[PDB]
């Protein structure tokens, strides 16, 4: 847990589910979505 400075980050297991993550990020953090965009890169050093 904690914020980043030079921005909230989290070290998260792959064992966790997706529904209580959604409850965490909508109920504690900001609001919902009418849309959601996915962009896939990362190997491009």
Swiss-Prot record:
Post-translational modification: N-glycosylation is not essential for but facilitates cell surface expression, multimerization, association with lipid rafts and ion channel activity.
Tissues showing expression: Expressed in dorsal root and trigeminal ganglia. Specifically expressed in a subset of pain- and temperature-sensing neurons. Not expressed in heavily myelinated neurons. Not expressed in neurons expressing TRPA1 or TRPV1.
Subcellular location field: Cell membrane; Membrane raft
Knockout-associated phenotype: Trpm8-deficient mice have severe behavioral deficits in response to cold stimuli.
Highest rank taxon of the organism: Eukaryota
Domain comment, as recorded: Cooling agents bind within a pocket formed entirely by the S1-S4 helices that opens to the cytoplasm.
Entry function: Non-selective ion channel permeable to monovalent and divalent cations, including Na(+), K(+), and Ca(2+), with higher permeability for Ca(2+). Activated by multiple factors, such as temperature, voltage, pressure, and changes in osmolality. Activated by cool temperatures (<23-28 degrees Celsius) and by chemical ligands evoking a sensation of coolness, such as menthol and icilin, therefore plays a central role in the detection of environmental cold temperatures.
Subunit structure of this chain's protein: Homotetramer. Interacts (via N-terminus and C-terminus domains) with TCAF1; the interaction stimulates TRPM8 channel activity. Interacts (via N-terminus and C-terminus domains) with TCAF2; the interaction inhibits TRPM8 channel activity.
Similarity comment: family membership: Belongs to the transient receptor (TC 1.A.4) family. LTrpC subfamily. TRPM8 sub-subfamily.
Protein name: Transient receptor potential cation channel subfamily M member 8
The species this protein was found in: Mus musculus (Mouse)
Gene: Trpm8
